[PDB]
């Protein structure tokens, strides 16, 4: 059958490692996912980054 799953997210390290820090926002994924799933998650990650950029340039959270 079909079900509903609550996809969850969290910030697993301090936001301000360095105010000048340029380290790209890493990603960690759970859910014993397959390789196609990993690529899909990476694609979604990049698109979310780009959309935030196109919408909220000031917010550098991602």
């Amino acid at each position: 059958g079909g079900s509903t799953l609550f996809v969850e997210t969290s910030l697993r390290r301090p936001q301000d490692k360095d105010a000048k820090g340029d380290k790209d926002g890493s990603l960690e994924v759970t859910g014993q996912l397959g390789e196609v799933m990993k690529e899909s998650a990476r694609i979604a990650y990049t698109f979310a980054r780009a959309f935030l950029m196109q919408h909220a340039p000031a917010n550098d959270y991602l």
Binding site: D24, R42, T46
Partner: protein, 62 residues
């Protein structure tokens, strides 16, 4: 020259003819760099050789 980029080429190409996406990838990168969308209803295929020279490919009929 100075920008981190993510490029996605959909799966499905047979291993041999996969490089046939060279010109497609190049034109996609150029379009992104200049933002000029490629002409509509257009397709391309073929290999690139680090210099601009292009090589034959197989499966033309398909």
């Amino acid at each position: 020259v100075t920008s981190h980029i993510h490029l996605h080429v959909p799966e499905g190409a047979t291993p041999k003819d996969g490089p046939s996406a060279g010109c497609t990838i190049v034109t996609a990168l150029l379009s992104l760099a200049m933002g000029r969308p490629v002409r509509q209803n257009l397709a391309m295929t073929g290999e690139v050789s680090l210099t601009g020279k292009i090589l034959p490919v197989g499966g033309i009929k398909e």
